[PDB]
Each structure stands twice: as C-alpha cells, then as structure tokens.
Design a protein around this ligand. Structure first.
Ligand SMILES: Cn1c(=O)oc2cc(N)ccc21
Ligand SMILES: [Mn+2]
Ligand SMILES: [Mn+2]
Lengths: 137, 137
C-alpha cells in the first residue's frame, strides 16, 4: 500500500541557479549537494534537484498543466508573492479558484504554485458548488 | 514560509484510464471525479488529475528525469512492484542509484517510482556510498 509522496525530483539544466532558487529565494533547507544534484526539504517534502542535460528551459505555453503546489499560510501569502515578484519570477496563470494561489515558474520552466488550503477545504467548496459532471465518493 | 507540498497536479490525456491507474492499480483513494479531473489522496498527498488536451503520451526517452516517488514499506515493496510488472506497466529505469526503488510509467508517461526509505535514511546511506562530489550540510 502506498503511504504518501516519498520525494519530488525536478530535472534542472543548471544546478547553481536551481539551488539558489529553491534554497535562497524559496527558503527551502539544503541538506546535501553533489556534482549532479541536490537534496532539499520543505516541511515534509523531500525535493531532489537532478542535473540533466535533457532538461529544456521550457516556456509555459509549451508545457502541459502538470504542476507542483507548495503550502503557505494565508497570513504569509502576499509577502511571499511580493518576494517572487521582486526577484522577477514569471507568473504562468492568474488565480480563479478557491483559496489563494500564486502560479510561478522555476528557472527551467517547471510550473509551481503557492496555495492556501487543504483538500478538505476544496472538497467542501466543491460540495456546495460542484464542477460540471462532479461525483463524490 | 513554505511548509511542504500542498498538492501534485498531473495533466492527463484521457481521464478515465488515468483515474483507473491511480485508484484501481495503485490503490489511491478517489474523493471526487468530474468531467475534467479527479481528486485523490495517497496518505497525506493531495493528487489532482487534470484533463489537458495539451498532454501527450510521452516515451521515457523523450522526457527528462523529473519524477514522482511514492512511499511504500519494506514489507510491501517487492510484491507491489511484481504486481505492476505482471500487469504490464511500462518502466523507465532499472539501476538503483538512490536505494530501493521501482521505476514505472503512468498511462501518459509520467515518471513514477516506488521507494522504500526517508530522506534521513538516504543521507545516511549516502555518507557510506556518496554520490561524486557530495557535501553534507
Ligand atoms: C465511473 N464514474 C464515476 O465513478 O464517477 C464518474 C464521474 C463522471 N463525470 C463520469 C464517470 C464516472
Ligand atoms: Mn494547483
Ligand atoms: Mn527518485
């Protein structure tokens, strides 16, 4: 039986800017680095950056909607978004759903998000206003 | 301050086989399904499957090393991997470069992994058998 997410691995084209982004800009904890990658943590999340010459710096119009959302409190959301904006981090989508969300790109174009709110919060909102075709279990 | 992964969203090309894969084959908990997506959980992980006409079925030689690993116990690992094998689930990697792992593909070619062990355990193993140039913080 699967018990959770063990780790997220992002392929990166250049290790140093990716470490700077996740550790310094985003505040994640750097535990180890080697010639071709790094291990960081963000709360329970184990993040691996893996240096990969096959990683393309990918414009957001050229990638699908796969994305990775990090938790932040409502109280901290606006100042973290402003930090990303000060650093010139590009936004790939505006929020139109429940709960605050900021949609931003990493140096290689990985699609990231800051989100406030749990699955339980989302399901409660959907119960009251279900999406088209929505069934609950 | 970022506190972990809020959710993982995978773009899918065909919703029904993707729901079946994550719910029926992998055993995750299906909470809701609508015309364009589904919400599942795997332990504390919130997984969203999002129907995306941009998603392409991607062979593993065409994608980079970005991947998503799920936790499984030492007692369950081998039989779960063998069941995926017997079910014809495609693979993408054989060499265990990061411990006890099974590397497999979802219906769209998302790179998945079963892994036994925590980040702390991987750091301890790496101290004995470090990756080239490895530094520990
Ligand atoms: C089979 N099935 C299900 O369990 O929930 C559904 C929802 C939709 N929209 C379409 C099909 C299903
Ligand atoms: Mn999202
Ligand atoms: Mn892995």
């Amino acid at each position: 039986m699967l018990s959770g997410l063990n780790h997220l691995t992002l392929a990166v084209s250049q290790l140093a800017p990716s470490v700077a982004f996740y550790q310094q800009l985003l505040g994640m904890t750097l535990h180890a680095r080697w010639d071709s990658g790094a291990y960081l943590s963000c709360g329970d999340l184990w993040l691996c950056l893996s240096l990969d010459p096959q990683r393309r710096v990918t414009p957001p119009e050229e990638s699908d909607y796969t994305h990775y959302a990090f938790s932040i409190s409502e109280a901290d959301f606006a100042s973290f978004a402003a930090r990303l904006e000060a650093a010139g981090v590009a936004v790939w989508k505006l929020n139109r759903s429940e709960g605050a969300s900021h949609y931003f790109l990493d140096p290689d174009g990985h699609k990231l998000e800051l989100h406030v709110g749990s699955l339980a919060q989302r399901l409660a909102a959907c119960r009251e206003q279900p999406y088209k075709g929505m069934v609950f279990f």
